[PDB]
Amino acid sequence: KELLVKQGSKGTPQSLGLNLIKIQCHNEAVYQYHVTFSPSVECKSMRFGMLKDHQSVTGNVTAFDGSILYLPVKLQQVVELKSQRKTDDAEISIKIQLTKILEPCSDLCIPFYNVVFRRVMKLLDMKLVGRNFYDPTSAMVLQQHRLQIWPGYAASIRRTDGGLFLLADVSHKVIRNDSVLDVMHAIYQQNKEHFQDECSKLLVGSIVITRYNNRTYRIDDVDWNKTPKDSFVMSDGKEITFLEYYSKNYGITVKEDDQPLLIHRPSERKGEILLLPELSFMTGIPEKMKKDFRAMKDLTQQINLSPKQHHGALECLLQRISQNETASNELTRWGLSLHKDVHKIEGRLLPMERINLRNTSFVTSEDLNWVKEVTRDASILTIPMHFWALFYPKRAMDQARELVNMLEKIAGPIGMRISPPAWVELKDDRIETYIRTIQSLLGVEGKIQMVVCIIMGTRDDLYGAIKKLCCVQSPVPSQVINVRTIGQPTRLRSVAQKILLQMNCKLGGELWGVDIPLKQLMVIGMDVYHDPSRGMRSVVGFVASINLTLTKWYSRVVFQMPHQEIVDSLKLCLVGSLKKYYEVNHCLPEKIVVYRDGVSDGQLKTVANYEIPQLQKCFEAFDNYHPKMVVFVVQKKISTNLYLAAPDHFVTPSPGTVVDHTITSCEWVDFYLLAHHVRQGCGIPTHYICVLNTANLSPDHMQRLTFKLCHMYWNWPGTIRVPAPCKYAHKLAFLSGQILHHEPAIQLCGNLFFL
C-alpha cells in the first residue's frame, strides 16, 4: 500500500458530516480463540450467557460473536471448561485454543473491533434484526397499517486512508407485529373453508424474519401435516425434538403446538429447513396497505428524514453511548476511545462545466434543471417520424383519447412533419390477437414508428409475449403501457408530454455536447446485468463512444454460457465496438476509459487480475495496437451520507461535489461524487474506484471526466446516479436479458435505443 496523494487544488471546499471515530493504536497483541461448544448450542444467547458465567477463567474483558472469543491476555495453549445448561442440564465443554496473534496494524482486527462495538450497543437495549441494530424505544405504531417502525442505526467500523472510522446510517426498519401465524389466523377468520390457497398465495414469494437468531428466511412452501411434536436429526447426528431444541438453544417456550410448519429449500449445491410460524414474523410492508394516497404521506413523513434529522439521530446515538457507563467500559478496557462529537469531512465543488446546445451554451447553475427547454427547434440527429400504429382494447377508448389528442399539441412549437397515428382497435385482450395485429399490418407506418401495447391491469405473460414477438421476430420497437397508470386525467401533464418519449428516443434522437480538453478519448461503459435468481445466462451491456464529440454510442448484448465463468463475449464486444469506431471515425483511439459495474469490494482483485489482464491480451486482433487503458468501478448501494454544514444547520446539496479523503478504500484509489438531485432525503454519493490508471490522470481530471460523462444522457433535465454509458448498458442489458431473452436486432443499430 503506497502513500498516494489524493487531494486536488481547483475547486471550492465544503464541509461534510460523517466520520465519527479516531483511535490511537496501543495494544501489542490480541489473542484469538476459536471455541467448540460440545454439545452444540446454536443461539447466541447461551453462547453469551455461559461464557459470562466463567469470568473467573476467561476474564471480564470479553468479545464473543458466537464462535470466536478475543482476549488481551494470553492463556495456555488449550483450556477446557465445564458448564451446565439452565434448562436440560447439559455437559457443555468449552474448549479455548489460541489460533491467531493479531498485530496492532493488521486488517484482521476489523472483525473484532466490530464485534466489540456490537457488544457495546447490545447493552443499550438495542435489538438485532438482519444485520443492523434497531431501537425499540422511539418506535411508531400504525394500527390501520398493522405496522411498527423502528429508528435504528446501521453502523459499521472500517479502515480508511484517514485511519479507523465508523459509518452509521440512520436505517428505519419496518416490523410487522402481525406474524405469519396471526395473519394466518386473520385469513382463516376471513375465510374458514378456503384458507390454504390464500396461504399458498401470500406465503410463497413472501419472506419471513425469525428472531431467535434474527435470520431472514425465504419461504418456499408451507406444510400443515407436520408439527414440532415430531422430532428430527440435527448436526451432531443425534435425534432431537424441536421443543427441546428451543429450550436448549433459544429458550423461547412456545405458546401453542398445533400451528403448521414452514419449509425453506435453499439453492442447489441442500439442507431443507423448517420454521415455526410463532417465532417467524412478516416482512412488515403490506402492498395491500399501499394502494391509497395516505400511505407514505402518513408513514414516511419521518422515515424520509431530513439531513438534520440524520444528524440529530446520530448525535442521540453518541449521547446515549457517552452517558452509559457500562457501554463506556466495554470501549475503554480495549482502549478504543470513541469521539464524543462528530468528525467532519472537507469538500470540493468542481468548476462546473458548460452544456453546449445547437446554438446556445450554458454555464451549469446550482440547480441543474432545464425541464421545459424541449420543443424548441428541430434536431439534426433525428429521423423525422410520420406514422405509428396505436392499439387499444375494448375497454379504454377515451383513455387513448387522453394521450394522443394532446401529443400532436407538442408538435406545435416544433412543427415537424407529423401525422396522426394508425388507430387500430383490438377485439380481445385475452392473450391472443395482439400478437397477430402488429405483424399482420407492419405497413406504411413501419419506417420510423412506435408500438404502443396498452394492457388493462398487471399481466406479466401478455407483455412478455408482446415484447418477445415485437423485439425478436421482426426489426421493431415496442412499449408497454398499463391503463392503471394513465387511468386519471390528473396524471396527464407528467405522463404524456414530458415523458413517454421512449419511442422518440428509441429511433435515435439526441444532441448536446460537453467540452473535453483531451485528444483521442475513447470512453466505454461496460456493465454486467446478472440474473442468477432465475439461474440462467448473465448479460453484458456494452456501450462505447464511437466518435470524437461523444454524440454517438455503441450497443451490444451477448448471452453467456452456463457453467462457464470465463467471458467468451467481451472480446467479440470490443471487436464490434472497434469495428463501429473504425467505420464511423475511420481511426483508432489513444486512451481507453472503462467504467465497469457491479463487483463487491473483495472482487476488484479479480477485476485487477482475472478480467482486465484479459482485456489487455484481447488486443492481439489488431497489429501494433496496445495503448494505455483506464479502468473504473461504479458503486450505487452506498451507506455514506453527505450533509453540508451551514452554520445554522445541515443540508445535502445538489450533485457536483468531490469527496476523496477519509472515506475511501485503504488499498485502491477511490472518490465519491454526489449524484442524488436532492428534493428530500439524504443524498447518497456514487463511489468510483479505479483499478488501472496508467494514463497519468490527475484526480481532478478523472473526477471532472466522470462528471462530464454524467452530463451526457438524453433522458433528463437533472444529473444521474451513474454516468451515461452505465445507464445505456443498464437499459439495453435489462431489456435484452429479462424480457425478450435475445440479442437486439442489427437493423436497429444506427439508433440509440438505450434511452
Place this chain on the structure above:
RNA sequence: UUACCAUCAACAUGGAAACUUGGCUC
C-alpha cells in the same frame, strides 16, 4: 415499462478470519 430520486422490502453473488468434513501423494 414512461425522466430520475428517495425510502422500504426481498433475492443473489463475492472477499477475509479460522473451525469441521472429504480427497492421489509423504
Place this chain on the structure above:
RNA sequence: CAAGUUUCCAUGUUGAUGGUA
C-alpha cells in the same frame, strides 16, 4: 485443494408507493 458453519462486511438487481413533474 474442495464443500459446509459462524463472524465481519461488500455488491448489484427486482417490486412497491411519496416527490419535482
